Amino acid sequence: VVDPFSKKDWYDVKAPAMFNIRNIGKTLVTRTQGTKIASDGLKGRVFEVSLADLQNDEVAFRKFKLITEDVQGKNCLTNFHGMDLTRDKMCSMVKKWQTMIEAHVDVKTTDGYLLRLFCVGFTKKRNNQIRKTSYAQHQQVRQIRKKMMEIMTREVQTNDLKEVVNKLIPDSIGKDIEKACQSIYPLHDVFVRKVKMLKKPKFELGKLMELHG
Amino acid sequence: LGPQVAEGENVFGVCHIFASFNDTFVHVTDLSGKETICRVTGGMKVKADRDESSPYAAMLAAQDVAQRCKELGITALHIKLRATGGNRTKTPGPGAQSALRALARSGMKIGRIEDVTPIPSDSTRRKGGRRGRRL
Amino acid sequence: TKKRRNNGRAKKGRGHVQPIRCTNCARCVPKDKAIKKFVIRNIVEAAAVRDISEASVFDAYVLPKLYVKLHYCVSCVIHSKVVRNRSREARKDRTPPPR
Amino acid sequence: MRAKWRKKRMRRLKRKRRKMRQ
Amino acid sequence: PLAKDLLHPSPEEEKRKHKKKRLVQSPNSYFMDVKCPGCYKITTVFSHAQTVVLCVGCSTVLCQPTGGKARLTEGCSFRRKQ
Amino acid sequence: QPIKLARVTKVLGRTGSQGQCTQVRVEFMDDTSRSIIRNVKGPVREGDVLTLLESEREARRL
Amino acid sequence: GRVRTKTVKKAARVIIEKYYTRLGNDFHTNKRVCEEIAIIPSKKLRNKIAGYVTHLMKRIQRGPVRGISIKLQEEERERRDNYVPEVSALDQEIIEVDPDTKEMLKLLDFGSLSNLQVTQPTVGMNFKTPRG
RNA sequence: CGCAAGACGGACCAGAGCGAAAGCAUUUGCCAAGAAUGUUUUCAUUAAUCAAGAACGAAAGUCGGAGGUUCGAAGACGAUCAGAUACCGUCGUAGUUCCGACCAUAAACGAUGCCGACCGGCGAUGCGGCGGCGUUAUUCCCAUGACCCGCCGGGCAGCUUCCGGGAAACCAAAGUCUUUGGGUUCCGGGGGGAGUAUGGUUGCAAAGCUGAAACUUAAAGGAAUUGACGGAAGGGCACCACC
């Protein structure tokens, strides 16, 4: 008889300041009753939103998982919880006559966020190459993977979450990896394929609001 | 009381399309996905188990979900469709295209389209035996 | 008598090849032997492109693609007409069909 | 008869022979 | 080609063949004399050297061993003997 | 359900296990943007001007 | 079901190739040339042979038919064959020659020729289709 | 949205590589190996094949101990069926995982022993070496990578040729064979009985190795050809077919 949506309120979740677009969507939460509070069931929510919805002109195949942390003034505050590429984007570059280098690193920012970064790269057929395949030898693969790992470490461990996401928006990490590995073996489609949050520092409203600076 | 949709803006939802080969699930949730708004499957319309996957059941389910979402405020939808995944078939059932098109024809605005099929990294053994289904 | 010089498989210069399961019947077939097809299709069928695009929020979205690699056994390929029997002279032709 | 199943019958027969002269 | 004078072959063809397959086997290697700008005594070096041979009067090396021919270093002038 | 004088420039022929269904590619007169392929019974000759009654739900297959 | 049987085709082609002067776009001419030299004994046959010679004449104004040979078309083709251009195609003032063929000509005691022009060869050395 | 358990390394992944074979695919480090190439090093016949003997040897199976997701012999149901005791579906034990000890078998196959020589061509490809216009990164000539054009040596192969062979299918070896002899190991002698019995031996067991005869039989078999048939595929036709 009584539909539950008559006991439900709508909040306007928001993104941090490093994104051009602030309002990224709404969210439904039931009204507070009993021991249940409207916020504890709202903090643990993750929005998988395309980057093109958070930047005026950027790639649409990059997705950011933003997790709510509190609700101030019926506005849900979100921070960076993950970064991915779309399934079709990843599948559209795994061709069958090149080698794929998959590097990854557990690294920590200067502010205490522990991130696992996954970088993927694909060897590039030269514009004058006749040979069908563009494989790299195992030592070449190892050198490329080591360069990826050290570049990711030097580009995340020297920074904190805000500037790490700022350089993730245009994926400057992938461009740096490509220009470094060009000397070893030319690479074609290099990106930080994924970023996942392993452990993060204690919750603090100060840093949260400082992110929306 | 309800949503705060502006005059020209559209509020968004996320549509999960489980296009198996036994029936089609049309699911709608918040952008997060944590709050389920309304879910109608292909087996909620027809009682022919052969017909649970057929495109007509998907059309009926998608039109029902579009009506319920419109009466609940949501006007635009994000698309996140899946097959059975796992070790089983990695292809949408016969109702994925039909359900998507029925949502589009019901006056909905389609947002982004993504595939959320569970793709293992060579996970556990497939259901079929060594020789497979011999029928 | 030997119907095929390659024994109907690509195994050559090695001893064993990991098997894969048929995508239609779940039969274990060696990876080199299985018939492999790659489908890069549009998520919506060619008919439904117009109605999705006309009801798309963005301007010129450019629709995503389903990428699926299917592995079939011999029997399931013959039943699915992926390949068919060929004459003895034409069995030796490795050229993919012009399509 | 299939050669494998013929061999299986011979082995079962041999098992019965092993049993009877325990 | 049904008539090939194997007694007197082309010099290009014998230079093409393997060191052993030739009419009389000859090595593809040679000995050079390397001169350094600051030293006045010649040092003979094998073309396919297996060791890092050093110059006694200079801090630089004369050649790096490799999989084949040794890697001569710039700043040393080589002149092949014979 | 648009209404227009559809200029037909593409009639391919008949197909179907009852052989009365011709596939007509309805093209709009001065649009040159979209076309619809339909399986319809009856003689719809090449070059005729169809009466536009519906611009979706094309000839269904499978 | 109007495929002309080989009888009709052979008769019509022979008649056209033989007495094309008498044959225009008609039927009684065909029946007359039949009853004169190679008489055909029926009526539907003569009508179909007239129809096929009409069709072959329709196809013969646009060009020579494969199975027929008139003195007129053979004459035109042999005049085209006997065509002698006023200036030879091989009579070029200057001939571009690569350095390698230039060296070859030099080795043949033909390096002193003045009608050659040494042309710079290709900058790169790729000439194969990418394998795949 | 998290936690845990076990499994397995998808796409890249190839008629590609490595290994004696069985077999081998996430990274990184360590350990010992190995082919090939390069060598105007070294020893100097130290070599080849190989009874006895030895090492390794998929899966399943056995024993003992951990683990136990999924799959799944047996089994319990539910369908199909004339009946199914099967195929199909839901479960489900042993097993499927790791360790130790057994076993020593596969269509363990290239159904093709190893060492050596000789006898056509072509295009590729993996590794190493060598030479050489040119493009490209290292923001510098030369190195060196990435390509491009060749050459050499081993390797997995491929196309082509009446080299030649073969019953042919086919094989650049399955050729260099009545023009029969490079070296050497194993092994077959019409089909069944039968890889059975028995003895020996090995094994906890399963079973493994060696292994007959009486008797019975005029054929069994190989390759290819034509036809017929196919609940094989692709086209076409028929109101004695259908709609």
Swiss-Prot record, chain A:
Keyword Cytoplasm among record annotations: yes
Post-translational events: ADP-ribosylated at Tyr-135 by PARP1 in presence of HPF1.
Keyword Ubl conjugation among UniProt keywords: yes
Residues recorded as bearing ADP-ribosyltyrosine in the entry: 135
One of the record's GO molecular function terms: structural constituent of ribosome
A GO cellular component entry from the record: nucleolus
Location relative to the cell: Cytoplasm; Nucleus; Nucleus, Nucleolus
Chain residue numbers at which the record places covalent cross-link Glycyl lysine isopeptide (Lys-Gly) (interchain with G-Cter in SUMO2): 14
GO BP: any one term: cell differentiation
Similarity remark: Belongs to the eukaryotic ribosomal protein eS1 family.
Name listed for the protein in its UniProt record: Small ribosomal subunit protein eS1
Organism: Homo sapiens (Human)
Span within the parent record: 21 to 233 of 264
Swiss-Prot record, chain C:
Listed InterPro entries: Ribosomal_eS26 (IPR000892), Ribosomal_eS26_CS (IPR047864), Ribosomal_eS26_sf (IPR038551)
Subunit structure: Component of the 40S small ribosomal subunit.
Main localisation: cytoplasm
Protein's name in the database: Small ribosomal subunit protein eS26
Locations listed in the record: Cytoplasm, Cytosol; Cytoplasm; Rough endoplasmic reticulum
Name of the gene this protein is made from: RPS26
Native organism: Homo sapiens
Any one GO molecular-function label of the UniProt entry: structural constituent of ribosome
GO biological process terms held by the UniProt record: cytoplasmic translation; negative regulation of RNA splicing; translation
Family: Belongs to the eukaryotic ribosomal protein eS26 family.
UniProt lineage: Eukaryota, Metazoa, Chordata, Craniata, Vertebrata
Cleavable signal peptide: none
Swiss-Prot record, chain E:
GO BP: cytoplasmic translation; ribosomal small subunit assembly; ribosomal small subunit biogenesis; rRNA processing; translation
Record keywords, A-Z: Cytoplasm, Diamond-Blackfan anemia, Metal-binding, Nucleus, Phosphoprotein, Ribonucleoprotein, Ribosomal protein, Zinc, Zinc-finger
Disordered, as annotated region: 1-22
Cofactor descriptive note: Binds 1 zinc ion per subunit.
Expression by tissue: Expressed in a wide variety of actively proliferating cells and tumor tissues.
Annotated positions binding Zn(2+): 36, 39, 55, 58
Gene3D superfamilies recorded: Zn-binding ribosomal proteins
Zinc finger extent (C4-type): 36-58
Biased composition (Basic and acidic residues): 1-15
Any one GO CC term of the record: small-subunit processome
Modified residues (Phosphoserine): 10
GO molecular function annotations of the record: DNA binding; RNA binding; structural constituent of ribosome; zinc ion binding
Subcellular location: Cytoplasm; Nucleus, Nucleolus
Disulfide bond annotation, renumbered to this chain: none
Cofactor(s) required for function per UniProt: Zn(2+)
Transport keyword on record: no
Pfam families xrefs: Ribosomal_S27e
Disease: Diamond-Blackfan anemia 17: A form of Diamond-Blackfan anemia, a congenital non-regenerative hypoplastic anemia that usually presents early in infancy. Diamond-Blackfan anemia is characterized by a moderate to severe macrocytic anemia, erythroblastopenia, and an increased risk of malignancy. 30 to 40% of Diamond-Blackfan anemia patients present with short stature and congenital anomalies, the most frequent being craniofacial (Pierre-Robin syndrome and cleft palate), thumb and urogenital anomalies.
PANTHER family (alphabetical): 40S RIBOSOMAL PROTEIN S27
Family: Belongs to the eukaryotic ribosomal protein eS27 family.
Protein's name according to its UniProt entry: Small ribosomal subunit protein eS27
Species name: Homo sapiens (Human)
From Swiss-Prot, chain F:
Bilayer-crossing regions: none
Domain of life (superkingdom): Eukaryota
Localization annotation: Cytoplasm, Cytosol; Cytoplasm; Rough endoplasmic reticulum; Nucleus, Nucleolus
Gene3D superfamilies referenced in this protein's UniProt entry, alphabetically: Nucleic acid-binding proteins (2.40.50.140)
GO molecular function: RNA binding; structural constituent of ribosome
Positions where Phosphoserine occurs in the chain: 35
Biological processes per GO annotation: cytoplasmic translation; maturation of SSU-rRNA; ribosomal small subunit assembly; ribosomal small subunit biogenesis; ribosome biogenesis; rRNA processing; translation
Gene Ontology CC entries for this record: cytoplasm; cytoplasmic side of rough endoplasmic reticulum membrane; cytosol; cytosolic small ribosomal subunit; extracellular exosome; nucleolus; nucleoplasm; ribosome
Keyword annotations from UniProtKB, A to Z: Acetylation, Cytoplasm, Diamond-Blackfan anemia, Endoplasmic reticulum, Nucleus, Phosphoprotein, Ribonucleoprotein, Ribosomal protein
Record InterPro entries: NA-bd_OB-fold, Ribosomal_eS28, Ribosomal_eS28_CS
Associated clinical condition: Diamond-Blackfan anemia 15, with mandibulofacial dysostosis: A form of Diamond-Blackfan anemia, a congenital non-regenerative hypoplastic anemia that usually presents early in infancy. Diamond-Blackfan anemia is characterized by a moderate to severe macrocytic anemia, erythroblastopenia, and an increased risk of malignancy. 30 to 40% of Diamond-Blackfan anemia patients present with short stature and congenital anomalies, the most frequent being craniofacial (Pierre-Robin syndrome and cleft palate), thumb and urogenital anomalies.
